[PDB]
Protein backbone atom coordinates (compact mmCIF):
# COMPACT_ATOMS: atom_id res chain seq x y z
CA UNK A 1 0.00 0.00 0.00
CA UNK A 2 0.89 3.63 -0.67
CA UNK A 3 1.29 4.62 2.99
CA UNK A 4 -2.38 4.19 3.89
CA UNK A 5 -1.60 1.28 6.25
CA UNK A 6 0.93 3.29 8.28
CA UNK A 7 0.50 5.98 10.96
CA UNK A 8 4.15 7.06 10.92
CA UNK A 9 7.77 5.97 10.46
CA UNK A 10 10.82 7.12 12.40
CA UNK A 11 14.39 6.58 13.53
CA UNK A 12 14.67 6.58 17.31
CA UNK A 13 17.58 6.42 19.73
CA UNK A 14 17.89 5.06 23.26
CA UNK A 15 16.06 7.65 25.06
CA UNK A 16 12.82 7.52 23.16
CA UNK A 17 13.78 10.52 21.24
CA UNK A 18 12.75 10.57 17.55
CA UNK A 19 14.98 12.41 15.05
CA UNK A 20 12.43 12.16 12.22
CA UNK A 21 9.00 10.86 13.25
CA UNK A 22 6.96 11.52 10.12
CA UNK A 23 3.56 10.72 8.63
CA UNK A 24 3.94 8.65 5.43
CA UNK A 25 3.50 11.48 2.92
CA UNK A 26 6.06 13.67 4.66
CA UNK A 27 8.44 10.72 4.86
CA UNK A 28 7.87 10.27 1.09
CA UNK A 29 8.57 13.99 0.59
CA UNK A 30 12.10 13.51 1.97
CA UNK A 31 12.62 10.63 -0.42
CA UNK A 32 11.38 12.70 -3.38
CA UNK A 33 14.25 15.09 -2.61
CA UNK A 34 16.66 12.17 -2.92
CA UNK A 35 15.47 10.26 -6.02
CA UNK A 36 13.15 12.78 -7.71
CA UNK A 37 10.15 10.44 -7.41
CA UNK A 38 8.65 7.84 -5.02
CA UNK A 39 9.84 4.25 -4.56
CA UNK A 40 7.12 1.63 -5.35
CA UNK A 41 4.13 1.06 -3.05
CA UNK A 42 5.13 -0.02 0.42
CA UNK A 43 8.83 0.75 -0.07
CA UNK A 44 10.30 3.33 2.31
CA UNK A 45 13.77 4.80 2.18
CA UNK A 46 15.95 6.59 4.73
CA UNK A 47 19.23 8.38 3.88
CA UNK A 48 21.89 8.50 6.65
CA UNK A 49 24.90 8.94 4.36
Amino acid sequence: NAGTDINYLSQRTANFSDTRKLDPKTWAAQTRRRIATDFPKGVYYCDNR
Binding site: T13, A14, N15, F16, S17
Partner: protein
Protein backbone atom coordinates in the same frame (compact mmCIF):
# COMPACT_ATOMS: atom_id res chain seq x y z
CA UNK B 1 19.26 36.69 26.84
CA UNK B 2 16.64 38.83 28.52
CA UNK B 3 15.19 38.14 31.93
CA UNK B 4 12.02 39.99 32.90
CA UNK B 5 10.85 40.67 36.45
CA UNK B 6 8.39 39.75 37.69
CA UNK B 7 8.11 37.06 35.16
CA UNK B 8 11.49 35.65 35.57
CA UNK B 9 13.00 32.86 33.50
CA UNK B 10 13.11 29.69 35.66
CA UNK B 11 16.51 29.56 37.23
CA UNK B 12 17.27 26.25 35.68
CA UNK B 13 15.63 23.25 34.06
CA UNK B 14 15.01 21.51 37.35
CA UNK B 15 14.68 18.07 38.83
CA UNK B 16 11.44 16.99 37.19
CA UNK B 17 13.28 15.99 34.07
CA UNK B 18 12.48 12.41 32.61
CA UNK B 19 15.69 10.35 32.28
CA UNK B 20 14.65 8.31 29.30
CA UNK B 21 17.29 5.76 28.88
CA UNK B 22 20.58 4.28 30.05
CA UNK B 23 21.67 3.63 26.45
CA UNK B 24 24.69 5.70 26.58
CA UNK B 25 27.18 3.10 25.86
CA UNK B 26 29.33 2.77 22.89
CA UNK B 27 30.83 -0.66 23.03
CA UNK B 28 34.55 -0.44 22.10
CA UNK B 29 35.34 -2.23 18.95
CA UNK B 30 37.92 -4.94 19.10
CA UNK B 31 39.19 -6.33 15.66
CA UNK B 32 42.05 -8.09 13.74
CA UNK B 33 42.40 -7.13 10.07
CA UNK B 34 44.43 -9.00 7.49
CA UNK B 35 44.79 -7.93 3.77
CA UNK B 36 47.17 -10.73 2.50
CA UNK B 37 46.69 -11.97 -1.01
CA UNK B 38 49.78 -12.88 -2.98
CA UNK B 39 51.11 -9.83 -4.89
CA UNK B 40 52.74 -10.44 -8.39
CA UNK B 41 55.45 -7.98 -9.41
CA UNK B 42 54.07 -6.54 -12.62
CA UNK B 43 51.08 -4.78 -14.24
CA UNK B 44 50.40 -4.57 -17.88
CA UNK B 45 49.84 -1.19 -19.63
CA UNK B 46 49.58 0.05 -23.13
CA UNK B 47 52.41 2.36 -22.61
CA UNK B 48 54.16 3.77 -19.69
CA UNK B 49 57.29 5.94 -19.67
CA UNK B 50 57.53 6.88 -23.36
CA UNK B 51 58.04 10.42 -24.64
CA UNK B 52 56.77 9.98 -28.12
CA UNK B 53 58.04 11.99 -31.05
CA UNK B 54 55.64 14.75 -32.19
CA UNK B 55 57.70 15.24 -35.35
CA UNK B 56 60.92 13.67 -36.23
CA UNK B 57 63.68 15.44 -38.06
CA UNK B 58 64.51 14.34 -41.50
CA UNK B 59 67.23 11.59 -41.33
CA UNK B 60 69.52 10.08 -44.03
CA UNK B 61 72.40 7.75 -45.09
CA UNK B 62 75.16 8.65 -47.61
CA UNK B 63 77.05 7.36 -50.62
CA UNK B 64 79.32 8.54 -53.37
CA UNK B 65 81.19 6.87 -55.91
CA UNK B 66 82.90 7.12 -59.13
CA UNK B 67 85.83 8.23 -61.07
CA UNK B 68 87.29 11.35 -62.69
CA UNK B 69 86.68 11.15 -66.39
CA UNK B 70 86.16 13.80 -69.12
CA UNK B 71 85.65 14.77 -72.87
CA UNK B 72 86.91 18.44 -73.50
CA UNK B 73 86.94 21.09 -76.28
CA UNK B 74 89.37 24.12 -75.90
CA UNK B 75 89.36 27.77 -77.17
CA UNK B 76 91.51 28.46 -80.15
CA UNK B 77 94.83 30.21 -80.00
CA UNK B 78 94.71 34.09 -80.34
CA UNK B 79 97.21 36.86 -81.13
CA UNK B 80 98.72 38.22 -77.97
CA UNK B 81 98.07 41.91 -77.53
CA UNK B 82 100.76 43.48 -75.40
CA UNK B 83 103.60 42.62 -73.08
Amino acid sequence: ALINPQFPYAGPVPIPGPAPTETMPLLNYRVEGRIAGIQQARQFMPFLQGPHRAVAEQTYHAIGTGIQMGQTFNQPLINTQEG
